Every structure is written in structure tokens, then in C-alpha cells.
């Protein structure tokens, strides 16, 4: 006898989202962030902010990159500083929840 049990541990992978959001000079996007291990995770989307209106930034997304700058593996205090000096179309590389 031979009993074969295929496909055990199957996985469909993760999706990578590439979105663009407008940011005004010194006006925050309206998304609170937290650090989960190395990665940076969006924890909240502020009601009525630039991120809420666009519909492309969500509570739970991982921020890999913003305008060609590696966000994964950075302190949230550094992401705050990087974001404070940003304006116009910001390109976000994300891994949705």
C-alpha cells in the first residue's frame, strides 16, 4: 500500500499594493502607525483625513516603502520625521492585512 496526501501546507501568498496619496505641506495624512517587530503597521485611519478620503490606506497595512525609502525596519519616530518633510504624490508600497 501507498497512500498519498498532496498539497498539505498550501498557501496562496500575500498581495503587494502600490498606491499614491496626496499630502499637503505640514498637514498629516491622518493614519496612526505602530511598530510590530521590525515592520511598520498602520493602526488607525483618522476620520476625514487624506488617507480616509482616498480609500487606499487601511488599518492593518504594512508599510514597506514610501517614495523610494525603506520604511520596514525603522523606528516609528523616524517614519514621523520622514513623513513630516513630504508633500504631493506620495507612492506607498504596502502589504495589506
Amino acid at each position: 500500500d501507498e497512500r498519498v496526501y498532496e498539497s498539505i501546507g498550501q498557501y496562496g501568498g500575500e498581495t503587494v499594493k502600490i498606491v499614491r496619496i496626496e499630502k499637503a505641506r505640514d498637514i498629516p495624512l491622518g493614519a496612526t502607525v505602530r511598530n510590530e517587530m521590525d515592520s511598520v503597521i498602520i493602526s488607525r485611519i483618522v476620520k476625514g483625513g487624506a488617507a480616509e478620503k482616498s480609500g487606499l490606506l487601511h488599518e492593518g497595512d504594512e508599510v514597506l516603502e514610501i517614495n523610494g525609502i525603506e520604511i520596514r525596519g525603522k523606528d516609528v519616530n523616524e517614519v514621523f520625521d520622514l513623513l513630516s518633510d513630504m508633500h504631493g504624490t506620495l507612492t506607498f508600497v504596502l502589504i495589506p492585512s
Partner: peptide
């Protein structure tokens, strides 16, 4: 606390 951004 979580930062605004």
C-alpha cells in the same frame, strides 16, 4: 503611543 503621521 502610536504616532499620527
Amino acid at each position: 503611543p502610536d504616532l499620527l503621521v
